[PDB]
Amino acid sequence: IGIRLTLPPPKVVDRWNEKRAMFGVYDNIGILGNFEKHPKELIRGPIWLRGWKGNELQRCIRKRKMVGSRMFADDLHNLNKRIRYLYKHFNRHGKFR
Amino acid sequence: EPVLRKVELPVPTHRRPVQAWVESLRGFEQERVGLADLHPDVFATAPRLDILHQVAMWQKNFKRISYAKTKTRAEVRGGGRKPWPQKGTGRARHGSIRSPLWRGGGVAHGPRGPTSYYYMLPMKVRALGLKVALTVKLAQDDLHIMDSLELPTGDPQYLTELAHYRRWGDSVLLVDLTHEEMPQSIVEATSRLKTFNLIPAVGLNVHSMLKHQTLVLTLPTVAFLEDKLLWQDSRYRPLYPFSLPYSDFP
Amino acid sequence: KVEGDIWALQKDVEDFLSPLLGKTPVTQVNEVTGTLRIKGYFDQELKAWLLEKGF
Amino acid sequence: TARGTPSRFLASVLHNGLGRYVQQLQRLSFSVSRDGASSRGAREFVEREVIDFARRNPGVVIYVNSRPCCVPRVVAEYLNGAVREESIHCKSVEEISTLVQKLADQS
Amino acid sequence: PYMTREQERGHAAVRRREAFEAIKAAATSKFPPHRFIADQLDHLNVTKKWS
Amino acid sequence: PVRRSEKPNWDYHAEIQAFGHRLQENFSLDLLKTAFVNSCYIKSEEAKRQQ
Amino acid sequence: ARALDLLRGLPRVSLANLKPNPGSKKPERRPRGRRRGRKCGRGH
Amino acid sequence: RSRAYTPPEDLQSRLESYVKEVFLPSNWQDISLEDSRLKFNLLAHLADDLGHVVPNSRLHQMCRVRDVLDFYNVPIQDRSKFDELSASNLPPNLKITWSY
Ligand SMILES: [Mg+2]
Hints:
This is part of a larger assembly, with 8 protein chains of 8 kinds. Chain D has 107 residues and is of the alpha+beta class. Chain D has helices at residues 40-47, 49-56, 93-104, and strands at residues 27-30, 61-64, 73-77, 83-87. In chain D, 26% of the residues lie in helices and 17% in strands. The two termini of chain D are 23 Å apart. The complex binds magnesium ion (MG). Magnesium ion binds at residues 76, 104-105 of chain B. Magnesium ion (MG) binds at residues 76, 104-105 of chain B. Chain B: GO terms for molecular function: RNA binding; structural constituent of ribosome.
């Protein structure tokens, strides 16, 4: 059917462990540190999208203009494909016109 | 002996001084040694829990950038031709065996792209809310501010037994003036504090401000936070980015 | 940036406004935000009323 | 609907229309957790209404087992030998009193 | 009819003025809500523990 | 079907006072507590004391 | 100033309380259902 | 290691004695708390004799000696709920337990 059969694995999760303990510690970095470095650098994440959060089409546009010459050919053709798709997607057919 | 740590910035006359006891971790059963104050802008502003929830959101969404993706009507493998005879059978024709209507194809409007939600929102307001949460911890019988975060002992059990003896709370976050100048004994004992934590100067922030049951601020560091909130108080129109030199920046 | 028992300031603003337009003041405080707002622009005279209050 | 469900005519415990108001609520067991969110307002009954409840009609079995549990519970049994279980999850203190008295005036 | 055509002309005007005034007084009192802060504090208090 | 003596929230003194109050007719609590006891359970408990 | 003490009249303001201000965001209605949407932004 | 507090009987007299140890003039309750080290010593003696000081969040509202006596005259009854509700002497129709 569509249910489980027994009670599932017991969710051993310590909500108070170290790798979550400092979650945002030293993360008011800018005005609480005499303006040396903004929070706009403290994020450890991909350089395609580290803090210019536009739309989906914008997301891909930034991915291209940042790292396109660093992809295998499948990713380049893929990013080009969806970029063409989205450029057609924005201004063609929708609810508000 | 006594000690009276007033605030350096002149708090206005439209409120009295914001005073409390001054503590220390030196005495294992000897607290309440000295008493001092702070400006109303430091620990006695309006309650303003809404600002605190704003601080909560700007915290919990600050850096997370999820990576979950999918495939579109051209991404997953296969699909260029008409899949089967469109009208010979009684079935349904399609465009592909690789569109999102069949068993294996597309997750049509799923989260495309490793997305991010950074928010460098109003930083002075973030400061005021950080002050607000500090004030909340002040009134909530939680702001036990110590003179200096020295460790009179090396055992973490000394800290645990004092904390149960002080009836501080179930969780503790103690923060100092300088990380290199943080006392070696305090951090060494603190390294096994499985639920308590120690923190440097800039780290006083919102999710941290809810994180423990109570926070233990160092006295000169408390003044440092006051000065920071004071520079947060009445910031003129920025015409240059405040990382470079100014007239009186430090 | 109002502070204190703001409802008294609302009553005072209605009283000053009472001769100003006759109708009762359409005003709302923002108790969490610690503010007072009056429908309509009675601005310069309100600044005068606060100035004559001196504080 | 109705015809898909059974029937049971209007009667009493022991033909008590004559003798006396033989109040038919032998047992009733609310319970709250020491750290329990949903039973918080129900704790209010455990604060206020339960003493008032036994004041109003002491002749019933009032139970607060009050386990460190997940939700409030009402265990009603009576001289009719049946039992009805009443959830009180996320209810109001006024609603707690309403549930209590409505359970009381039943059979 | 119990009276002439011009006989009760205006015979119910003062109450008409009163009714129009009442409609005008009660009608247009739409404006921003007035919000207390203790209500926000109480909604904060809703996660209350026992003793 | 186990007896209600073997479920939660039972107290013999409490149930005895319930036996007093529920009928809205008073009684001597010690006398009634004795009265609810027959002798078969007395024999059963006396035999159970031997094990 | 009754504000701080009135706040002191509750338990510790934990993370379980930071409510968005009433009027933060209008409800994110999925364009469907028995009341809001039957054709979802296009009509018949 | 106990938060339990009871107001003493000689509180006004011991308070006047501690005030004299802190400072002289009439109207003892009208002495304000603008002074710093005097406030420190006064609260120190009051806590040392009493065993119960005001909350540090309550220190800022402490501005005079009358409220200082009053908060020291305020009874603080504290117990667990399984200890407090049970000790309210509820009627025989219920005996609640909190096995936590
Ligand atoms: Mg697939």
